[PDB]
């Protein structure tokens, strides 16, 4: 049921943190105020879309974790490096 059952183990707090983690991994936020800049806001939006997409794909928190950390890896090791 719901988002493949596992949903109950990932509350909005954890979601928000993970979004933050993605954002930070993409662009290391100097201070929360930075989030107010459209440049950053776009990254925040993208991070939310990614996080949501992963959530709505993964059949387990484990898989979700893999995909999120994998995403972080790719964005640095694949993309820029």
């Amino acid at each position: 049921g719901v988002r493949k059952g596992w949903h109950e183990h990932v509350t909005q707090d954890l979601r928000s943190h993970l979004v933050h983690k993605l954002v930070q991994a993409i662009f290391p936020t100097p201070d929360p105020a930075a989030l107010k800049d459209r440049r950053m806001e776009n990254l925040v939006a993208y991070a939310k879309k990614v996080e949501g997409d992963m959530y709505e794909s993964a059949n387990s928190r484990d898989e979700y974790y893999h995909l999120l950390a994998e995403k972080i890896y790719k964005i640095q090791k694949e993309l820029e490096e």
Partner: peptide
């Protein structure tokens, strides 16, 4: 399949594991 590929290859590049660990340690 793509899962397996990415995981299998990235498991050969432990910075991925460091990121996993960091994600676990950082995110509740």
């Amino acid at each position: 399949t793509d899962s397996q590929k990415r995981r299998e290859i990235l498991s050969r590049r432990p910075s991925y594991r460091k990121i996993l660990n960091d994600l676990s340690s950082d995110a509740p």
